[PDB]
Amino acid sequence: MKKIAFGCDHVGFILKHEIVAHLVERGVEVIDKGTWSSERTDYPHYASQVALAVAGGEVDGGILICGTGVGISIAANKFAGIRAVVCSEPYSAQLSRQNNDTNVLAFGSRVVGLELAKMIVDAWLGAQYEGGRHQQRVEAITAIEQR
Amino acid sequence: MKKIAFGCDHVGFILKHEIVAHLVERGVEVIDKGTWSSERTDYPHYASQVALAVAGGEVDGGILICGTGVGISIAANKFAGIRAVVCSEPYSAQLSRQNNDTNVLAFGSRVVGLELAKMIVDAWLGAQYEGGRHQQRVEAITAIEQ
């Protein structure tokens, strides 16, 4: 995860500058997909921008923030080749990389505070997909897509 | 949410008996898609069973349990007509009903303890979808499905 496409709605935006700064500090190139203010806007559009960038290989992964991260991650997961984890603790983030090869992480600005959110990001970026027995399971997910 | 399709893998199974018993205590009729023991099994199959039930209108919603809930909910979200929330607290569950009309709830037997899980289930079951400005956003999720 060297370059990441970032997206958020107006509610997720409250964490944007700090999370972007944290990613730059961790040495990742952030491709910013918006939004750019607290002006009311629709989360599915930003989900699409990040998801398209990840699925099309222009970026290694995506990070998405809304009020809870849930709606924005449901939208992302609708795209083929996207496996998005939403969570409020770092164990789920870490294991989803290890077992599910997640390429998109989401969380909620009204659920997690900033420093917990930073720890979830670190746990996600720090984990490696373990393949092995988990591969046939991940392949089952793809099969669901292409039916 | 009067009829719920339930599914889990062998790790999610550690919460099955008490979560199913709790749904029944709250007057929910549970359609059990398995699994039925702690023998190793693959979570995508139980995701499909629940998703196909919800999508085909056989039940009102779905509940899924694995180690974290994430892989099983990612699988479920790949099905047309499913909006699945995974979480480890009740706020996300509740708001996902209110704003996103979620029809599947997932959580992790290795992430949340039993009584917190019951509270998440209660919040999800008790919340109403509010429609309004949210329907446009939900319609956009469906548009991605095509």
Swiss-Prot record, chain B:
Pfam families: LacAB_rpiB (PF02502). GO terms for biological process: D-allose catabolic process; pentose-phosphate shunt, non-oxidative branch. Induction: Induced by ribose and repressed by RpiR. D-ribulose 5-phosphate binds at D9, H10, G67, T68, G69, V70, G71, N100, R110, R133, R137. It is an enzyme of class 5 (isomerase). Inhibited by iodoacetate and glucose 6-phosphate. One of its GO terms (molecular function) is ribose-5-phosphate isomerase activity. Keywords: Carbohydrate metabolism, Isomerase. Transmembrane segments: none annotated. Pathway: Carbohydrate degradation; pentose phosphate pathway; D-ribose 5-phosphate from D-ribulose 5-phosphate (non-oxidative stage): step 1/1. Its EC number is 5.3.1.6. The active site is at C66 (proton acceptor), N99 (proton donor). The keyword Isomerase applies. The keyword Isomerase applies. SUPFAM superfamilies: Ribose/Galactose isomerase RpiB/AlsB. Catalyzes the interconversion of ribulose-5-P and ribose-5-P. It probably also has activity on D-allose 6-phosphate. Homodimer, and homotetramer. Belongs to the LacAB/RpiB family. This is Ribose-5-phosphate isomerase B. It comes from Escherichia coli (strain K12). The gene is rpiB.
